[PDB]
């Protein structure tokens, strides 16, 4: 009887197939001849964009140990070439067919296909990805559209990419939405670049809920009155967060757009602009678009007539070329029959860690958990290790399954509380999820085993990327030692991140929010760093058009759009006229000077009490996770 069948092979399945091959576990992969959206994009020459996630969070540990030299954002082309490279390695183990049905019995499943061939396997892993409405827009995208109006009812990474492609042809963009959370994908920390996922120091949640909340939530919740922040200049960007019923911040189910702020875009790409655009580095600064009026926010009930395809805003009845409805995603699951009769109903919250479904035997889901920030790789690498351990170690399988229902209840209580299920329940903070899996598997670090301040930097401030947990022990990957050293030397051992948490231990959330926005350039949505890049933007639009062979006439002027922009930007025209690093810098020198100091022996009695707090980091009081114990 076949031990393992993996259904679907694109990106998510790669690390699981790697571990099954290593333990010489019998497996067969079944995956559709048609492949994925990435194959649609490759075939039509539309791999002309870049990831919204860093190299370190987006490629697997076993590629990073070879290929990491510096932080960067991979291209779509690079992401696809990496899928194809691993597909080539495993192609002989892939049956090209499409699974229509799975009948699940007490200790095996019967797998049915479009060809008619059936398969029996003891363990079945689904790695089939999602159907996304928006994929048609991207794969079938027409660029010879110019001077048209588009209306979006949802703001997401897919909408933000479409918008980046539309604005250069003087398409006007209306967002008729209930607000959105957009975050600079890159931040300058004393003039030195950090991806946003590098600043999250998630294991500080173990110090306290309250402290981590103050550390993370001021750019998401409207907590500062600072008139430089986008959510003060453009309040239609704010969201109803009245659904949140968890002390875990940021909450499971929060989604965010990650985008290039134009100042970082300029820093990376100004010196070879057309070449970088041709590679797929596209400026997607939603905050610059709002600043310049290339995008407008309108209330979610602005008059729209779908029959005449007009939207009416102030006193102009605006013709629109296209309404883009919000991007629903659902797992591509075949029919699953419980005891080979009763349709399984999929619900993220009713699975353990998004991986283990109830009422099914030896079926696992891989790739259906979405990271709040950073790449999918962090999530699917840790899921793969979890699945591999459940499949290959009956002792582990027993330990997790014996109380599966109670684990799932305890997880939902911690992360969702009383909130009713939401379509984005599958979205998790990456650094909580990787750590959660690591503790379930036993490849976690123990904060009490930190000896030096350097060890505390590693435990609390070094990002919880999947490769962090592959340095030693059961799932060690050769070269992770050298990789962690390179990362640490490039980022000063994450001392700046560690110092951030120190600086706010004593503040309330309002003080922390003001303090967070007290910099010359704060991390996220700083509207003071837009006007200075208006000339660079015209250089950019010219370079984009050259790359794409488009002529558009800027000397033709859309007078009715100019009028709608005025109305949309009334709060900005009032708020904007009203427009940390000291401390942080002295914090870093203190910490970098006690790097090799023993923690437990640090003396009693800013500089004095920050030492005591550092000593307490050996015994965090909010460590318990009841879904694991
Ligand atoms: C436009 C776009 C941009 C993205 N940008 C990023 C980014 O910046 N960073 C990032 O980390 N992630 C990003 N992602 C998300 C994620 O990395 C991709 O969606 C990735 O393709 C997910 O891999 P997967 O293996 O889960 O699914 P896929 O890559 O979709 O592979 C699944 C495979 O299973 C096959 N299959 C499905 N159903 C069956 C069946 N019943 N029988 C047999 N075969 C089946 C499919 O044909 C397919 O080949 C992006 C996604 C999209 C669409």
Q: Three-state SS for 10?
A: coil
**DSSP per-residue codes, 178-240:** S---EEESEEESSSSEEEGGGG--GGGGGT-HHHHHHHHSTTTTT----TTBHHHH-GGG---
Q: Which atom of ligand 1 is nearest to the CA of 57?
A: 11
CA distance readout (Å), 419 to 140, 153, 201, 241, 255: 37, 24, 26, 11, 16
The upper half-sphere exposure of residue 491, i.e. CA atoms within 13 Å in the direction of its Cβ, equals 28
Domain ranges (residues) in the chain: 2-132+329-447, 135-328+524-578, 453-506+581-616
List Cα–Cα distances, 555 to 289, 539, 559, in angstroms.
Answer: 20, 16, 12
The CA 428 to ligand 1 mean position distance, Å, reads 18
Q: What is the three-class DSSP state of 596?
A: coil
Number of Cβ within 10 Å of residue 522's Cβ equals: 22
Closest atom, ligand 1, to C-alpha of 333: 41
CA 488 to chain centre: 22
Q: Which two tokens stand for residue 401?
A: 């399954």
In the structure encoding, which two tokens stand for residue 306, read together?
A: 């779908």
Burial of residue 185, with CB atoms counted within 10 A of its CB: 0-12 exposed, 13-18 middle, 19 or more buried: buried
Using the Cα atoms of residue 176, residue 184, residue 431 and residue 394 in order, give the sign of their dihedral: positive
User: What is the resolution in angstroms?
Assistant: 1.9
Question: Annotated binding residue at 464?
Answer: no
What does R_g of the chain's alpha carbons equal in angstroms? 25
Ligand 1 centroid vs 35 CA: distance in angstroms?
A: 9
Beta bridge partners of 174: 151, 296
Give the position, in ligand 1's atom list, of the atom nearest the Cα of 31: 44
Query: Does the annotation list 255 as a binding residue?
Result: yes
Look up residue 153 and give its DSSP letter: S
Which tokens go with 311?
């939207």
C-alpha distances out from residue 227 to 54, 565, 572, 574, Å? 30, 19, 9, 10
> Taking each helix axis from N to C terminus, what angle separates 376-392 and 430-441, rounded to the nearest 10 degrees?
20
What is the dihedral sign for C-alpha 435, 436, 437, 439? positive
Beta bridge partners of 446: none
Looking at domain 2-132+329-447, its CATH class is alpha beta
1 is in an annotated binding site: no
Residues 185, 209 contacting (CB under 8 angstroms) = no
Ligand 1 atom 6, closest CA: 51
Nearest CA to ligand 1 atom 41: 99
CA separation for the pair 125, 356 (Å, rounded)? 10
The answer to whether the CB of 620 falls within 8 A of the CB of 448 is no
Distance of CA 503 to the CA centre of its chain: 26
178 appears as a binding residue in the annotation? yes
Taking the CA atoms of residue 61, residue 65, residue 66 and residue 71 in that order, the dihedral angle to the nearest 10 degrees is 90
Ligand 1 centroid–CA 351 distance in Å is: 20
Pairwise CA distance, residues 471 & 430, whole Å: 18
The candidate with the shortest Cα–Cα distance to 386, out of 359, 351, 339, 360, is 351
Residue of 432, 397, 457, 393 lying closest to 591 (CA atoms): 457
Q: What residue's CA is closest to ligand 1, atom 10?
A: 375
Strands (E), 445-547: none
Q: Which atom of ligand 1 is nearest to the CA of 41?
A: 1
* Rounded CA separation 414/105 (Å): 32
Is 155 annotated among the ligand-binding residues? yes
Say how many Å lie between the CA of residue 493 and the centre of ligand 1: 33
Distance 125 CA to ligand 1 centre (A): 15
- Ligand 1 atom nearest residue 368's Cα: 26
- The pair of three-digit structure tokens given for residue 533, joined into one six-digit string: 């890049």
Experiment used for this model: X-ray
Separation between Cα atoms, residue 424 and residue 314, nearest integer Å: 34
- How far apart, in whole angstroms, are the C-alpha atoms of residue 106 and residue 339? 7
Ligand 1 site residues, Cβ closer than 6 angstroms: 7-12, 30-32, 34-38, 51-53, 58, 98-99, 127-129, 132, 135, 138, 332, 334, 367, 375-376
Burial of 77 (0-12, 13-18, 19+ CB in 10 A): middle
**For residue 604, how many C-alpha atoms fall within 13 Å in the half-sphere facing its CB?**
0
Nearest to residue 553, comparing CAs of 542, 563, 543? Answer: 542
């Amino acid at each position: 009887m076949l031990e393992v069948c993996i259904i679907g092979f694109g990106f998510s399945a790669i690390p699981l197939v790697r571990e099954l091959a290593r333990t010489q576990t019998e497996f067969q992969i079944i995956s559709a001849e048609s492949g994925s959206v990435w194959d649609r994009l490759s075939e039509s020459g539309r791999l002309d964009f870049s990831l919204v996630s860093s190299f370190q969070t987006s490629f697997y540990s076993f590629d990073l140990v070879r290929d990491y030299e510096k932080d960067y954002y991979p291209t779509a082309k690079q992401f696809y070439e990496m899928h194809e490279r691993w597909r080539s390695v495993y192609e002989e183990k892939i049956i090209r067919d499409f699974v229509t049905k799975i009948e699940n019995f007490k200790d095996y499943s019967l797998i049915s296909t479009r060809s008619g061939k059936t398969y029996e396997a003891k363990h079945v892993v689904l790695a089939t990805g999602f159907d996304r409405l928006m994929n048609t827009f991207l794969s079938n995208f027409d660029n010879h559209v110019s001077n048209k109006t588009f209306v979006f009812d949802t703001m997401g990474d897919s909408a933000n990419l479409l918008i980046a492609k539309l604005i250069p042809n003087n398409n006007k963009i209306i967002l008729r939405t209930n607000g959105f959370t957009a975050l600079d994908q890159e931040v300058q920390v004393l003039g030195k670049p950090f991806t946003l996922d590098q600043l999250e120091s998630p294991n500080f949640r173990y110090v306290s809920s309250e402290l981590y909340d103050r550390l993370m939530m001021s750019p998401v919740y409207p907590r500062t009155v600072n008139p430089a922040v986008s959510y003060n200049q453009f309040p239609l960007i704010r969201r109803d967060f009245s659904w949140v019923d968890s002390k875990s911040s940021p909450p499971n189910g929060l989604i965010a757009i990650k985008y290039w702020p134009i100042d970082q875009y300029y820093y990376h790409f100004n010196d070879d602009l057309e070449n970088y655009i041709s590679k797929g580095y596209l400026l997607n600064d939603i905050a610059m678009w709002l600043h310049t009026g290339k995008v407008i926010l309108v209330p979610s009930d602005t008059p729209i007539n779908f029959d005449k395809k007009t939207i009416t805003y102030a006193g102009i009845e605006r013709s629109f070329h296209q309404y883009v409805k919000g991007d629903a995603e659902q797992p591509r699951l075949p029919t699953i029959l419980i005891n080979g009769e009763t349709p399984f109903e999929y619900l993220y919250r009713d699975t353990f860690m998004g991986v283990i479904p109830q009422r099914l035997n030896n079926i696992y889901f891989l790739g259906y958990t979405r990271p709040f920030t950073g790449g999918l790789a962090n999530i699917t690498e840790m899921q793969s290790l979890f699945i591999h351990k459940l499949i290959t170690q009956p002792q582990f399988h027993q330990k997790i399954h014996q109380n599966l229902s109670k684990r799932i209840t305890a997880y939902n209580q911690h992360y969702y509380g009383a909130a009713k299920p939401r379509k984005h329940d599958h979205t998790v903070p990456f650094g909580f999820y990787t750590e959660d899996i690591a503790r379930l598997i036993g490849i976690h670090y123990q904060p009490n085993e930190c000896r030096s301040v350097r060890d505390l930097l590693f435990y609390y401030a070094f990002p919880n990327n999947a490769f962090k947990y592959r340095l030693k022990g059961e799932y060690a990957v050769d070269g992770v030692d050298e990789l962690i050293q390179k990362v640490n030397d490039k980022h000063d051992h994450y001392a700046q991140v560690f110092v951030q948490a120190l600086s706010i231990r004593n503040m309330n959330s309002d003080e922390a929010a003001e303090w967070d926005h007290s910099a010359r350039r704060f991390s996220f949505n700083d509207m003071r760093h837009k006007e200075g890049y208006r000339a660079f933007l015209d250089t950019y639009l010219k370079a984009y058009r050259q790359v794409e062979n488009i002529s558009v006439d800027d000397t033709v002027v859309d007078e009715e759009w100019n009028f709608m922009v005025k109305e949309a930007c009334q709060v900005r025209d009032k708020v904007a006229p009203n427009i940390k690093d000291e401390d942080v810098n002295k914090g870093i020198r203190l910490i970098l000077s006690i790097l090799d100091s023993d923690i437990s022996s640090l003396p009693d009695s800013f500089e004095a009490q920050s030492i005591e707090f550092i000593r307490r980091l050996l015994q965090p009081k909010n460590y318990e996770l009841l879904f694991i114990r």
